Ligand binder design. Structure first.
Ligand SMILES: CC(C)(c1ccc(O)cc1)c1ccc(O)cc1
Ligand SMILES: CC(C)(c1ccc(O)cc1)c1ccc(O)cc1
Lengths: 225, 225
């Protein structure tokens, strides 16, 4: 099929581990510390991954940073959604960190994790493919609506190149549904909504000061609130 | 062109007036009272308008209510965006109520109104047509991601019928841009984001108790928070 899609597939990063501390008693603080720690390390991987998107590394460093600062939370959440597709009512943050309803309750994440499960259920019913996943991830990056973009034309071109890839892929692989590309795009508002709420939630947790957070995650949280 | 589009055009409601109280001194409280009062009356008009969308009135009353309860804020904001297209840095809430930067500052709405202006600027550059406007409004209603839907198949069919109309319209009227429909759909995440933030803001203002709010607006605010 489409070359941008196959390129995005080979650029897809390796899974990383949560490694929750086995000497520490389970609590809300432990789960949150674990999750924030995992996200901090994934952000490093996401920065590396973005460099493989055609056109991205030719934007100015400022525009690259602006896109990443706007989109990072949506990209993280899309990841856990995709990892969770073949599970039921469980969220696979990592192979060694799967949250069910009870742990979500414990961590104070029930409402947020329930919103993420709503995303999972929608992609389950549409039978989201890996090809579609990696392309939406790139589109979420490019369509992240940063207020601080310099070369808007270049960013729009980036959006168009990725949108075309999605369109091309869907035309060749899903002839039975000529509106599948548009259906995929219409899942983006729920991703943006959930991401907006997630940024607010973890910012409150930053302010409360009981959960340790690393520099990158904090920096990224700061730029979005 | 497409019949659903022409039908949505004739179903488009009359503009209503803000009628700010001319005996009351300008303040944050006056602006907010005016805006909330305007929204309350527009919600009545939006309920009436929805009945004209093909398929909508055949959903159960519960599913109709669920869609409206999820989508109402996006529909209000899309309205002010459309009214503001031919203005510069001004938001036309009504013909007798146009907010500039200073009044937004006064009302404590600078950040929220700046997000709405970001929407305006994006549709200006794409040259949003009235045909496209009324169709996106209907799509925002149908794609509102309520958690409490009963007949999901019927709602998805509603989404598909409206998405097809957009697709049909764009194919016939904008042959020069075969991705225009998808570009329109990719504006929806910014609308959802702004609407999510707006619901949080006015809910805080509800809690503070200094701004009088009518029953419908309060009821709708309650169902979304
Ligand atoms: C940002 C967050 C810590 C996270 C961590 C890791 C991850 O892969 C995806 C998301 C997160 C967000 C929302 C949420 O409900 C749980 C965890
Ligand atoms: C909901 C609100 C009072 C409104 C009132 C009327 C309207 O047409 C659109 C929006 C509103 C939301 C966000 C905002 O920044 C100003 C006013």
């Amino acid at each position: 099929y489409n070359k941008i899609v196959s390129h995005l597939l080979v650029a897809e990063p390796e899974k990383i581990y949560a490694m929750p501390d086995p000497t520490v008693p389970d609590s809300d603080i432990k789960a949150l510390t674990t999750l924030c720690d995992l996200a901090d390390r994934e952000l490093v991987v996401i920065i590396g991954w973005a460099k493989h998107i055609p056109g991205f590394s030719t934007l100015s460093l400022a525009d690259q940073m602006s896109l990443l600062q706007s989109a990072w939370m949506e990209i993280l959440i899309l990841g856990v959604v995709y990892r969770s597709l073949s599970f039921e009512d469980e969220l696979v943050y990592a192979d060694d960190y799967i949250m069910d309803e009870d742990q979500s309750k414990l961590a104070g994440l029930l409402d947020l994790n329930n919103a993420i499960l709503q995303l999972v259920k929608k992609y389950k019913s549409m039978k989201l493919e890996k090809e579609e996943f990696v392309t939406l991830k790139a589109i979420a990056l490019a369509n992240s609506d940063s207020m601080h973009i310099e070369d808007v034309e270049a960013v729009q071109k980036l959006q168009d190149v990725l949108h075309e890839a999605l369109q091309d892929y869907e035309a060749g692989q899903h002839m039975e549904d000529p509106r599948r590309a548009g259906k995929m795009l219409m899942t983006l508002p729920l991703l943006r909504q959930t991401s907006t709420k997630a940024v607010q939630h973890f910012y409150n947790i930053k302010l409360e000061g009981k959960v340790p957070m690393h520099k990158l995650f904090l920096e990224m949280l700061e730029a979005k609130v």
